[PDB]
Design a protein around this ligand. Sequence first.
Ligand SMILES: CCCCCCCCCCCCCC(=O)NCC(=O)O
Ligand SMILES: [Cl-]
Lengths: 98, 270
Amino acid sequence: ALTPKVQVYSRFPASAGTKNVLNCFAAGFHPPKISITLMKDGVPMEGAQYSDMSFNDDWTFQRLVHADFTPSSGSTYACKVEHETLKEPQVYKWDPEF
Amino acid sequence: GSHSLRYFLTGMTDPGPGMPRFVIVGYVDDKIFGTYNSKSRTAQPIVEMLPQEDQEHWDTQTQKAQGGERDFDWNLNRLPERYNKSKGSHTMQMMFGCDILEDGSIRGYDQYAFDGRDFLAFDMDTMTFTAADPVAEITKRRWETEGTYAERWKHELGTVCVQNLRRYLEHGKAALKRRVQPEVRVWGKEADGILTLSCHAHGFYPRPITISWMKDGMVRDQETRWGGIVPNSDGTYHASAAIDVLPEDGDKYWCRVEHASLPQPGLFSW
Ligand SMILES: CCCCCCCCCCCCCC(=O)NCC(=O)O
Ligand SMILES: [Cl-]
């Protein structure tokens, strides 16, 4: 492929109203330029941090984006990914499992 | 008792808004210990892993890094034209390091990639190069004929690297020996006729973990799919497996997780 492969997960087992961290991991892509945005209800989350560019042993690039959040039972959390291999941004929905 | 030090170096002509052109990430046993990038132009430890580093060590590291950034700049400038593909963005990568195996023998790794594709590699134990293709061969023959790189990198891989690994394992021993159990959550959701059971392991160290699914005491590899092992921001890891089940059989399925932090594998239901 060479497009991003994207996984969205929380640092801890998620629970409504308990402070946590939402992670968006994108991997397997090339070139390394890439846009990853964490979002609540389609609003970008504040305070997001981005890992130093690194790559897998197959040379494919990867990046972790994370941000503090307190999951809300009535919110949709998503990760939006733009990459030159994609014609339109792809969004990936967090599955809260709670 | 096997331990590893790895440097992952990227040079980029198009890193993206607010992003460095040249990045070095250093890992010991799957923990980031230090970083360099062209914006900071400094090499710096992860203070969580390396709480009491001397400035002397990281001055040396910072200067070797800056030298590495120059060399990548020189590659990114010559290689595209040599490969008759000067159009586009371009990347340069290097992976190198060493292993100290449980018996004390050493292994060196030294590999390069241009535009995400194998370019060149060097084997410390024979001090010979290999090229990925006829254009890389030009680089290989120039370097081995000049004689200097092989001495350099034999020394770098088999001495300097080995010394720094030994140092980082000692300095970071508080962080390296602390075993961190996975926190496991099993969860199903029923759509149409099927129920998706997902088993997620949260925040474990060290990085190797196994996850598998069970009906009775029989595994069910055929219907399982694994998300793979992915990082957290704090030097732990995340892993997951999923399986689809008839919704009237979900209490019969158990998630099994093996990890160095668990004397016995752990069994988790929905
Ligand atoms: C974790 C931050 C500390 C970084 C450690 C410094 C190690 C960087 C190694 C220099 C890379 C040199 C590239 C190269 O291959 N140049 C060509 C040549 O050596 O002739
Ligand atoms: Cl339960």
